């Protein structure tokens, strides 16, 4: 799902997430049997990152931690 | 003797029909044909439309069966394919337009503005474009319906609204077998007929009241229409061809979150509006 | 045409407008215009528009008659030729159809099967057999 | 000599078809012969095809019967007729193909693997008569619909999806009765029209929510 | 010129065709739409009504589609 | 030509019938208008009945909508 949403947001190689933040994402934001509601949140991540990128572009790649989830 | 005259009258209508064919048909339908070959559904999709086109054309001129398929062909030709509005523009200009139409609504405004950020970041790329669905839940007093025009003016898009909810006719959502007397493609498709873009603004007013049970279930039909990826290949009962509904930007209106079927509820991008404050109330009263 | 070939020696624009306006080939509403127009120059001009549209209709109606008459012969000739070609094949098909089918039924009628059902089909079969064109009931009788 | 009479009559009727039946008769001699050559036509399906073939030669003059008859014949021309896809020989390759499309789903993956292993070991035609049928039950969030495309791509069998999301009157999913306009917007056979293989993988929107009318 | 020429031809052919059968048919409809020109509706539905009447101005008398097309 | 001759004979029989049966059918519609006259329905109901018989006469018979229209 993450590669697909990253490709759909066109900002490939600019945002990355750790394996610990995802645990919190599912355990605190979406509680459904499937993962259809998870793709909408994972694309919201890229959509909000694109808002920051458009006004100000950074260099390299950005790593998202469990404490940086509320911003995006 | 009466049969003779009737036959003389017939050729009279024929001569007239042939004259009309030289106008509405022939080169006119040839130009529309080549034009659709330019901006119509892909050829592998247009195949059904061609199927009906061949028979309706092969059918004797003026044949009702020819018109029975002629309406299908005209609906395919009129409905937009691979043609869209101008793409991402400056966010600074559109944010003022979105702010002046409605005070507050920070979440919806953020959603609308950030929808353009990805459109700008995917400039010139080769990735699938999918306009997210939108649902607004809140009391009826909240101006959710005016968003259909507010967002459209925000991105200069064309907008249409369909009064769904409180309906019991699946055939309304997915039209119906063209074989039945007359023909009516699903409402959605009727709404998008006049909007000549593949990414219109569609407002599903109060779909919460959607009533199912008896009769073909309108709601169950909207499952194929609102599938996030299968809408790229969408075959309703009328338009046999797989419609490309991916680019269409959807907005749905609801009043609560307890009267929606589960497949619909766990497929929407949920946006909630709990209600304006009294300071916001006095501000909007003063300004608008 | 008698009223036109008698005053051709006068070149008065008003007189020519009168000649081209009295022959009212249109509704009486237009005739009110010519009846009350203080512009002889425009008189012939507006009559020109009416007669020109009427002239379009003149040729148009003649063409319609020409199209209908030519189509009449083509439809008649086509009807005679096309009917014969089909009636020929349909005659063969009818024999290869119920005519062969009933034969198969006769083959199993060795048990003395009641032919009352056949006679009813024959009523349908004599009528459709004679009709070597169309007769969709023949197909339903065939399945019967 | 009588056989040559039969051939002469057949070529006469074919000639009339070709000369008059636009897109029906000349399309007959041009492509319908090859149609049986490519897809094939059951003799029972063909004998009636030939019986009605000489009956719709009324084009140019015009005949709705000829068109609706021709629509039926054209539908018969393309629907697969005992023509199967190249059967899979390496089920292990299919295993990786299916593992690169989804994660987990060890039950359905093994179910499909068993269904393919039995077919590869069918000695004597006694299993092909019973087509394996799978119904998938669970929450809508699980990826059931795309599983049809995944399985079909792994089988190398062309895929088609059928809209069972809403079906009210009868014949809305099955082929509509013939004799009418002759226009069918999709059907169970339609999927067969989409896939030129007699053995494709076909998935439906759902079964719990389908037929719901009074007439049918 | 072209528009008036096609309107007049449609009117005369409707007149003759409905004099031979069912005078108060598509001639009634063409008179009614000539009225709706003078009492014109929104432009969005004006063209829709014109297209709708044009397609049913070419079919045969008593068509099953015409049964509801005339009443609409 | 024999098919044409039997068509001649059948339309002979049709002549015999429409003399008695057909005229009764016309007399049926004439008596229907006599019914709409004798009852003395108000002007609006008169016009509705006239329009309804107008839409019925334009179309043919043997259709499902025709039964409902006839009874109503
Ligand atoms: N912030 C706002 N600015 C302007 N008008 C507002 C605002 N909030 C609510 N309204 C007004 O409130 C009304 C809500 O009606 P409507 O949008 O039809 O509600 P609903 O979407 O629930 O059916 C409209 O007149 C709308 O313009
Ligand atoms: N284990 C999985 N592997 C791959 N994709 C999965 C998995 N679980 C869920 N999905 C995704 O779930 C989605 C299901 O969408 P779709 O099949 O259209 O509808 P439904 O969820 O109703 O079956 C697909 O995008 C699919 O890739």
mmCIF file of N, CA, C and O and ligand atoms in Angstrom, chain A residues 35-36 39, chain B residues 227 229-230, chain D residues 101-103 105 140-146, ligand 2:
data_model
loop_
_atom_site.group_PDB
_atom_site.id
_atom_site.type_symbol
_atom_site.label_atom_id
_atom_site.label_comp_id
_atom_site.label_asym_id
_atom_site.label_seq_id
_atom_site.Cartn_x
_atom_site.Cartn_y
_atom_site.Cartn_z
ATOM 1 N N UNK A 35 -8.670 -3.509 5.324
ATOM 2 C CA UNK A 35 -7.667 -2.452 5.262
ATOM 3 C C UNK A 35 -8.093 -1.412 4.235
ATOM 4 O O UNK A 35 -7.286 -0.577 3.811
ATOM 5 N N UNK A 36 -9.362 -1.459 3.823
ATOM 6 C CA UNK A 36 -9.863 -0.469 2.875
ATOM 7 C C UNK A 36 -9.827 0.930 3.476
ATOM 8 O O UNK A 36 -9.542 1.908 2.775
ATOM 9 N N UNK A 39 -5.974 2.530 3.425
ATOM 10 C CA UNK A 39 -5.394 3.184 2.258
ATOM 11 C C UNK A 39 -5.733 4.669 2.235
ATOM 12 O O UNK A 39 -4.916 5.489 1.808
ATOM 13 N N UNK B 227 -16.804 1.954 -5.823
ATOM 14 C CA UNK B 227 -15.595 1.176 -5.573
ATOM 15 C C UNK B 227 -14.372 2.026 -5.900
ATOM 16 O O UNK B 227 -14.300 2.603 -6.991
ATOM 17 N N UNK B 229 -11.322 1.528 -6.846
ATOM 18 C CA UNK B 229 -10.473 1.203 -7.985
ATOM 19 C C UNK B 229 -11.266 0.547 -9.108
ATOM 20 O O UNK B 229 -10.938 0.719 -10.286
ATOM 21 N N UNK B 230 -12.309 -0.208 -8.758
ATOM 22 C CA UNK B 230 -13.134 -0.832 -9.785
ATOM 23 C C UNK B 230 -13.982 0.175 -10.549
ATOM 24 O O UNK B 230 -14.562 -0.188 -11.577
ATOM 25 N N UNK D 101 1.016 -11.126 -5.585
ATOM 26 C CA UNK D 101 -0.170 -10.293 -5.719
ATOM 27 C C UNK D 101 -0.867 -10.006 -4.399
ATOM 28 O O UNK D 101 -1.505 -8.961 -4.269
ATOM 29 N N UNK D 102 -0.756 -10.900 -3.420
ATOM 30 C CA UNK D 102 -1.377 -10.714 -2.119
ATOM 31 C C UNK D 102 -0.461 -11.285 -1.045
ATOM 32 O O UNK D 102 0.506 -11.994 -1.333
ATOM 33 N N UNK D 103 -0.778 -10.965 0.206
ATOM 34 C CA UNK D 103 -0.021 -11.443 1.353
ATOM 35 C C UNK D 103 -0.949 -12.224 2.269
ATOM 36 O O UNK D 103 -2.073 -11.791 2.542
ATOM 37 N N UNK D 105 -3.551 -15.084 3.106
ATOM 38 C CA UNK D 105 -4.621 -15.757 2.366
ATOM 39 C C UNK D 105 -4.259 -17.213 2.074
ATOM 40 O O UNK D 105 -4.567 -17.763 1.011
ATOM 41 N N UNK D 140 -16.425 -6.759 4.101
ATOM 42 C CA UNK D 140 -16.125 -6.162 2.788
ATOM 43 C C UNK D 140 -14.737 -5.553 2.692
ATOM 44 O O UNK D 140 -14.253 -5.342 1.574
ATOM 45 N N UNK D 141 -14.088 -5.259 3.821
ATOM 46 C CA UNK D 141 -12.763 -4.667 3.773
ATOM 47 C C UNK D 141 -11.721 -5.571 3.144
ATOM 48 O O UNK D 141 -10.778 -5.089 2.510
ATOM 49 N N UNK D 142 -11.868 -6.888 3.315
ATOM 50 C CA UNK D 142 -10.915 -7.823 2.736
ATOM 51 C C UNK D 142 -10.963 -7.734 1.212
ATOM 52 O O UNK D 142 -12.016 -7.486 0.610
ATOM 53 N N UNK D 143 -9.809 -7.940 0.583
ATOM 54 C CA UNK D 143 -9.691 -7.797 -0.855
ATOM 55 C C UNK D 143 -10.204 -8.991 -1.630
ATOM 56 O O UNK D 143 -9.419 -9.786 -2.154
ATOM 57 N N UNK D 144 -11.528 -9.127 -1.711
ATOM 58 C CA UNK D 144 -12.123 -10.269 -2.396
ATOM 59 C C UNK D 144 -12.291 -10.007 -3.889
ATOM 60 O O UNK D 144 -12.097 -10.911 -4.709
ATOM 61 N N UNK D 145 -12.657 -8.778 -4.260
ATOM 62 C CA UNK D 145 -12.947 -8.486 -5.661
ATOM 63 C C UNK D 145 -11.687 -8.543 -6.520
ATOM 64 O O UNK D 145 -11.697 -9.130 -7.608
ATOM 65 N N UNK D 146 -10.592 -7.941 -6.050
ATOM 66 C CA UNK D 146 -9.334 -7.994 -6.788
ATOM 67 C C UNK D 146 -8.727 -9.391 -6.812
ATOM 68 O O UNK D 146 -7.855 -9.661 -7.651
HETATM 69 N N1 LIG G 2 -3.349 -9.277 1.872
HETATM 70 C C1 LIG G 2 -3.566 -8.403 0.893
HETATM 71 N N2 LIG G 2 -2.714 -8.380 -0.159
HETATM 72 C C2 LIG G 2 -2.937 -7.498 -1.140
HETATM 73 N N3 LIG G 2 -3.908 -6.598 -1.259
HETATM 74 C C3 LIG G 2 -4.739 -6.643 -0.205
HETATM 75 C C4 LIG G 2 -4.639 -7.493 0.879
HETATM 76 N N4 LIG G 2 -5.671 -7.257 1.775
HETATM 77 C C5 LIG G 2 -6.360 -6.288 1.228
HETATM 78 N N5 LIG G 2 -5.855 -5.871 0.022
HETATM 79 C C6 LIG G 2 -6.397 -4.812 -0.822
HETATM 80 O O1 LIG G 2 -7.772 -4.691 -0.554
HETATM 81 C C7 LIG G 2 -8.405 -4.033 -1.684
HETATM 82 C C8 LIG G 2 -9.747 -4.670 -1.944
HETATM 83 O O2 LIG G 2 -10.459 -3.888 -2.934
HETATM 84 P P1 LIG G 2 -11.597 -4.593 -3.817
HETATM 85 O O3 LIG G 2 -11.178 -5.992 -4.129
HETATM 86 O O4 LIG G 2 -11.969 -3.692 -4.948
HETATM 87 O O5 LIG G 2 -12.830 -4.644 -2.795
HETATM 88 P P2 LIG G 2 -13.166 -5.558 -1.512
HETATM 89 O O6 LIG G 2 -12.265 -5.076 -0.404
HETATM 90 O O7 LIG G 2 -14.627 -5.339 -1.216
HETATM 91 O O8 LIG G 2 -12.868 -6.973 -1.934
HETATM 92 C C9 LIG G 2 -7.386 -4.114 -2.833
HETATM 93 O O9 LIG G 2 -6.783 -2.845 -3.039
HETATM 94 C C10 LIG G 2 -6.353 -5.120 -2.313
HETATM 95 O O10 LIG G 2 -5.069 -4.935 -2.866
#
